[PDB]
Amino acid sequence: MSICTSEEWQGLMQFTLPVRLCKEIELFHFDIGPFENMWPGIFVYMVHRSCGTSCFELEKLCRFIMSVKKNYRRVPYHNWKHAVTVAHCMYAILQNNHTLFTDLERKGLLIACLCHDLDHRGFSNSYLQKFDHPLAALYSTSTMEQHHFSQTVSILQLEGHNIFSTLSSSEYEQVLEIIRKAIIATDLALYFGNRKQLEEMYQTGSLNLNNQSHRDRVIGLMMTACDLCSVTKLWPVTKLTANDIYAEFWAEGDEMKKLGIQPIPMMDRDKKDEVPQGQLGFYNAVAIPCYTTLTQILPPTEPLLKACRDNLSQWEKVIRGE
């Protein structure tokens, strides 16, 4: 497992954020894209702002973040950029719904988002379970996500990395649970059930944030919303991100071909033409319903729904040749 150098976490301690970035970070549609060098410092800032400067021991935090960074691989999409992207969206939702969530939860959720794709390979849970690869035997379901959490704990177990040590064993065990459920929730195979339950609970008015299982379900949908948030950016960022995703999908399809298996059209680079229709279907069946139910449960998150509506509109425009 990769460990940051002495030169990386200390430099991060030194980092400060420009004034104009402080303002824009608060926007849902903010794109971290153009600020690569500043990405670690952006997360620190977000953590300090959301949780408090007294929250974690700075030195332990810097080690943790820079070591998380080194455990993201050089893959087209499920990389370090994705991790910070997802953490930022979480920060925006949390800032607009601050007191609905406890100190511990905001700490856990921010750290969970950063680590939620730790050591991703560019391969889906479908690939691994239908090939093997020991990970699918180690985790029969949810599968990469179980691996991501395993990695999260491993990095915490590195010397001077455990940011949660100053917590009482009660709060400590809780924050791990928060992180575990939240990371697992990022398996999209689970999202569909989750959103139906939440839809059912909201429409009937059963929904109660004092109810832990309800609260667990809300957190998981927030995770889905953050995980998918590239659909909520300005169109050219969304379109550029779509390239990265397909780069990974097609590379998975290519390894499948090498091993004598036909991949689905989504992972088939020969089926490039079907992308806009595939996107349209993803927005209609996944993204739109996600951000709709989210807006219902958390009204301040509506700009997320709006941006996704806008991007759906764009994909429709591509389909009809415009």
Ligand X SMILES: CCCc1nc(C)c2c(C)nc3cc(OCc4ccc5ccccc5n4)ccc3n12
* Residues engaged in binding ligand X (CB under 6 A): 188, 228, 230-231, 242, 245, 265-266, 271, 274-275, 278, 281-282
265 interacts with, out of Mg ion, ligand X, Zn ion, none, CB within 5 to 8 A per kind: ligand X
Question: How far is residue 223's CA from residue 219's CA, in Å, rounded to a whole number?
Answer: 6
274 interacts with, out of Mg ion, ligand X, Zn ion, none, CB within 5 to 8 A per kind: ligand X
Q: Quick one: CA dihedral 261, 263, 264, 268, positive or negative?
A: negative
CB nearer to Zn ion: pick between 117 and 248: 117
52 interacts with, out of Zn ion, Mg ion, ligand X, none, CB within 5 to 8 A per kind: none
Cβ neighbours of residue 36 closer than 8 Å, sequence gap 6 or more: 81
CB nearer to ligand X: pick between 64 and 250: 250
Positions in the binding site for Zn ion (CB under 5 A): 117, 227
The amino acid present at 226, given as its one-letter code, is C
Q: How far is the CB of 9 from ligand X (least distance, A)?
A: 30
Q: How far is the CB of 120 from Zn ion (least distance, A)?
A: 8
- Name the active-site residue from 48, 78, 133, 148: 78
CB nearer to ligand X: pick between 103 and 274: 274
Point out the annotated binding site for a divalent metal cation: 82, 116-117, 227
Half-sphere exposure of 77 (CA within 13 A, CB side): 21
Among 36, 106, 28, which residue's Cα sits nearest to residue 72? 36
Point out the annotated binding site for 3',5'-cyclic GMP: 78, 279
Q: How far is the CB of 300 from ligand X (least distance, A)?
A: 22
Positions in the binding site for Mg ion (CB under 5 A): 117, 186
Q: Is 78 part of the annotated catalytic residue set? A: yes
230 interacts with, out of Mg ion, Zn ion, ligand X, none, CB within 5 to 8 A per kind: ligand X
Cis check for the bond before 214: say yes or no (omega within 30 of 0): no
Cβ neighbours of residue 109 closer than 8 Å, sequence gap 6 or more: 90, 94, 101, 178, 182, 219, 222, 223
CB nearer to Mg ion: pick between 185 and 201: 185
CB nearer to ligand X: pick between 208 and 262: 262
Q: Which two tokens stand for residue 243?
A: 């390239």
CB atoms within 10 A of CB 187: 20
Q: How far is the CB of 32 from Mg ion (least distance, A)?
A: 18
Q: Are 148 and 114 in contact (CB under 8 A)?
A: no
Question: How far is residue 219's CA from residue 102's CA, in Å, rounded to a whole number?
Answer: 12
Question: How far is residue 218's CA from residue 212's CA, in Å, rounded to a whole number?
Answer: 10
CA distances from 61 to 43, 160, 161 (A): 10, 9, 7
Point out the annotated binding site for 3',5'-cyclic AMP: 78, 279
Q: Which residues are catalytic?
A: 78
